[PDB]
């Protein structure tokens, strides 16, 4: 080792690995990554790979069939240059959220060559079965944990919100170490005590935003005066940013593992929050055969 | 086609596969599964099974590591004797209740030559995918909710529990379809309206009886007059049939997925609750090339 | 058998699938694929496929990793609804003409399920060694060699030209069975002779358009006085079609393989020709277990 | 590298694995392996084993199942923690003497990702075959023949015999290196001249123990005085060590590769020999990748 | 099915296929087996194959490896024709008396796609797990035992004897069943009762003479008024026929599962018996998907 | 690393090895290529290779099927003794030259173990594709082309010729760099300028002499003055260099990929190319880990 790759093709999907580049304190590697015009894809390894360490950092773009073909073509390339090692760098996990797909995507990822994997919060977490090689499914909560902390003013005057039954498990996790109540949603009603608190709902993902709205409008209703959304990835897909900006939220925090740079714009409610150092740290032990047992004893928001 | 085996080799775990076998219509394969002096197994296939259809049954033991070993020995005397299809029907997949366990378990299963799987309510149902080959996991709910409905009197004035916030995806399940209320459990407390009503707790599995014991314990305090739980797998390991029995809970209703002969005497409380017949509607789809689509349709209770 | 799915999502790339199944005289199999608004692809399979051979058409639209996504997962789907065979009908394999691409894309398609494929002319046929399944790499020259000589009028006054030295092996088989000569080209110049007489360059595909504009100009130059151009794929990428248009070209014929409405308004010299049958005879023999031998003896242009 | 593991779960079975790293003059790594009260198997890790290259030593106890079920699991822990070798060190292999299972135990044992065997005196060794990794299957025979010479008293007027025609082979292969002559007994009679001679029966295992006391009532009656038993492997399963007491055998001498704490004081006329030295002298070569030609040079009974 | 090959390439190699086919009552299958002048080698074959259950018969020719790639290319061009069944019937399997080759050998057959085995009296029975497909390892010894019956007189007046401790167990078995005594060979003595008897030398193999010369010298000397062999594999490489003529040995019998024009012309002492039949039934079961089980019931010397 | 071993069985074949060895300045390894008395192979390695990168060299001897064999059986000996990386360099890949079987010759390469691959102009390219593991395949052109500049006086009156319209693309790489015009041949006649020129024919493989004869009197009867042949490849089956000796050619110059002893001697106008240079940089980096990019920078003919 050590060869860090982007796979993907326009600068704002290329942010995160220009950071755990950074943080490293390495060069990127040269590729280039580009679209023939009849649409095909182009991966191209400037530099020798042989022998190395590659880890191969990838986002997922507005086309994310296209970020998959760019990864898997890359990984594909390493792999015919004899790369020792091809690790994926993937913090969204595409295809995740339901035949489960999830694993075809999983095996053409192996089959390409991939021999690891390091991922962030996948949408469940037995898709870590779904590979054939070793990966690392990174938590995000302790970043997000500590924003509540930091940034939200009155939090031990919150409740955590499930905005469904499903994440009612992942709300549970946050009262737990936030020493605080749980309240889930399920037209709809609501579970708990919600009267005269913040509410913060918590998820893995934001993606398709209705049923955080609706979240929202019931949490209203029963009184809760600040309502918050905090989930690790956010797709934010289409019309998202718009209908937050409208509506009874007040605000959304997401991480980096998916980049929004036009819905940060379209939404001044959304505010993002910096993880490259727990995909470095990854990276950093993953390099030196280090532990990885941690992983966050000595990072943090900071 | 059509071949039905045990691989189960005490009186009591073939109980299942009778009954298939009496719906079906059918005599059982002949096999003899013993045991060696030095505690190897023996299975030992005593028909053609040349390009037949064998649909392998196998219930979970005491000894649960010799219940695979059983299965996986037969499943590979099948392949070697150029059976046409082994379809393991494992309505309790083992190791499944959490490097992911349960698919390791999966892959030996494969590679020993199964070529399809029926299994009812898994643990975390994204294992289907721990498998490179088609499964089928099957609802034993249908056959719960109609037992509340005509076995429980006054079940409109229940509400649904989950022991944790883990199972409260699956008391929605259930409280939707009963129009029902649902409260969630999570030392603990309590979410939702319990006071004054019937308590139906709802799970996947009961082995470990700590936390039922709990849930039971705090919806009595909390005003609950009723406590019942009814999940699918009835594992009901060690000294649970007692503690069971001496505790809060009214009633326990499991499916016969996993047979339970000595609990049943040990606790009155334990209902059990008969399920071939999703087992053999699966295996007459699977036999004749139907579809699965209904499965439900003229299957009942009865 | 037999089921025929398309996985394409437009109707311009359902046309070939529709044209086949009206040759078969069937009705094609129902199902859905569409996008998701974040821009994962989605396949539903609306019907049994258990036990049955089921052949999947898939034509390249413009967004050529979208279509193959939009293969891929539907192939997935009827592996695991446990379909007897999937064979591939590809007409058009992307990512062929040049670490050798076409291969990790041959691998992912075996590794999804696939068990057979049908595909015309493939850019180096050595490709059918890149799957691990059987393939049928199949001719459309008879189709092209039966318009020539039926709607070129003069056509024993051409002479068959190859773009490029590279195509010089194809445009031999061309003249071969026209009992003509040969030209190649190779900025450029010319071998053969070719004044005074009709040029007809052959080659698999048109897609990038540059040098069959040069070949035209240099044809022109040396006294050809009228210029065709048959290929079995018209990929016509971007501003091909106007670029033809206004060029020496006096006439494109290619097959139908690759839909291009759009690009056949842009420019009325573009002449297709339809393969539907070569494809519907192909899947015919397949189906019925019979040798593929002739596999033109009797189907034709007409 | 490097660590050695037990996957065994008592004390008794971890006496071989403490003897191995006495010799090689380390400490064990830490593990659990316990068992569940619904009686699955746990195997956890208590330590990195990132890069390094892992030697999991695993004995067979009783429950033989169970044994396995250790062994894979732990296997499989370290693939999923990326250790850069994981060798199993299973000096005797179950389920060995006889569709071949001894086949099937191989496969999982490779699935679970084994990547090298280090095991003595196969039952058949064609079973190094039934692995696709490379596998030591290890002599015994020179630790058993120097005991003959040292302990064994006017051994210069043994017969070396064997049980059956199957042991001849291993028989010939003694007496050639103590320059004796053989016999071979095949109810039964006997091949050779074993009169007034002490007769040394020779096999790789014994655990029934049936025809070992026929060999020794035959031997007896055609007057040879003193009859011995060497094996390598002592299963002894059952009410072996009392029906050796109560018999003609005068002495029975077996290896270490299978644990008999018990047998031993139901029977001092089983004697064992120490064999962690051939063992920890393998897995010196191993890890040091020096050849393994020699292998006995320098090691001895002592 | 059902379609029978030849993959040899001279007519004395094609006596076996042309027996079965007679016995079958079937025409053999077209194809062509020869060799281009650079010693390649070309397999053609003239017919359809598809959907077809295909028998392909190789015995050994002089070139042992040009008989590999024949029916390695062979067994590779009838999977490219989507051959639904692709039996090897390879009677003797050739590397397999010994890095065990006989390994590396199986693995290509079956990566080249083999999907069954027949053949006879494998050097290591354990070889049948070194494939990982069904494999039918046949005996032999009912034709020859029935030829000491009928084709010996006084044989109730022999010894059977073991060339050497590895063949003890063969000679047990035909004692057995002949109810007689045996004795071992073991430069060399004999042990066992050899005097005024006829000795029946009995081995799967005859290929290298040396030791069969050695044991007919020894048992001349002890008194044995006549010596037979009798094995499965008549190798009978170079100048055997020749060492066999001039030596003590009175009569050698062996099976055709190898062709000896030649050695039969050498040496008269040399008599074949004709196993066609065993082979045929075998094949007759496994074409109609009845049992194995046998498979001697109704077949004969006749 | 490193290990040099040759897998062929005289000293003909073994010429390239050893001036391999020469220029890295290392001894061979030891190892024993010879043929057991039945014409099966053997191949003994007689040295430690443990953790070893191991290069085979292995040329075609006249017996090309037992080429292959003595290669496989010794790749196969390498994994079993845990060779760390098994590079086969194999400089002419046979059954190369038209269901494929160059991929079916590819995969029992990969399966017995080979983990990389060096070779020389592979007759189609695609092949590198037929492996599941790296491959070179390396360019001899520069050392031809330097050739021609340095040895054929007046070559700038020359006309780069393809023997048939399947080399053109070959003959026009040579014109481009040697900056001339190309003529392709195509019974037959010739497309181009040959006329009072030298004529070059330019193939990757001369080996069936026919067309190369042919080629030859038809640039004679066109006025060429002088006819040389440069192929990669020397195979020269049989009676090859008799027919180019009587013949028009008046020089055939080959490289050294395949030995050619008793051609140089039957005929003094074949010229052999040393190409040991390319193949020792191309060990030379992969066993340093150095790039391939260059490879020819500092390489010559000298
Ligand atoms: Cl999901
Ligand atoms: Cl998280
Ligand atoms: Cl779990
Ligand atoms: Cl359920
Ligand atoms: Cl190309
Ligand atoms: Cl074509
Ligand atoms: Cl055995
Ligand atoms: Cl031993
Ligand atoms: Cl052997
Ligand atoms: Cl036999
Ligand atoms: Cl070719
Ligand atoms: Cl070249």
Request: proline fraction near 4%.
């Amino acid at each position: 080792g050590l060869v860090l790759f982007s796979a993907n093709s326009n600068s704002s999907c290329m942010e995160l690995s220009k950071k755990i580049a950074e943080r490293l304190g390495v060069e990127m590697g040269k590729v280039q990554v580009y679209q023939e015009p009849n649409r095909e894809t182009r991966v191209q390894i400037q530099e020798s790979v042989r022998g190395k360490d590659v880890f191969i950092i990838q986002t997922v773009s507005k086309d994310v069939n296209t970020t998959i073909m760019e990864l898997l073509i890359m990984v594909y390339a390493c792999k015919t240059s004899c790369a020792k090692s091809i690790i994926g760098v993937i913090p969204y996990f595409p295809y995740s959220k339901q035949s489960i797909v999830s694993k075809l995507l999983a095996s053409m990822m192996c089959k390409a060559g991939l021999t690891h994997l390091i991922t962030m919060d996948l949408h469940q977490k037995e898709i870590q079965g779904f590979f054939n090689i070793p990966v690392d499914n990174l938590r995000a909560s302790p970043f997000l944990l500590q924003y509540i902390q930091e940034e939200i003013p009155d939090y031990r005057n919150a409740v955590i919100v499930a905005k469904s039954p499903a994440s009612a498990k992942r709300a549970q996790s946050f009262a737990e170490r936030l020493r605080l109540g749980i309240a889930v949603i399920h037209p709809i009603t609501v579970v708990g005590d919600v009267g005269g608190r913040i509410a913060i709902i918590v998820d893995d993902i934001i993606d398709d935003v209705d049923s955080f709205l609706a979240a929202a409008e019931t949490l209203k209703e029963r009184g809760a005066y600040k309502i918050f959304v905090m989930a690790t990835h956010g797709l934010l897909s289409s019309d998202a940013p718009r209908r937050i900006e409208e509506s009874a939220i007040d605000e959304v925090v997401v991480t980096n593992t998916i980049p929004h740079e036009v819905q940060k714009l379209q939404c001044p409610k959304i505010k993002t929050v910096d993880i490259s150092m727990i995909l470095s740290e990854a990276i950093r032990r993953i390099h030196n055969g280090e532990s990885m047992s941690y992983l966050f004893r000595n990072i943090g928001l900071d």
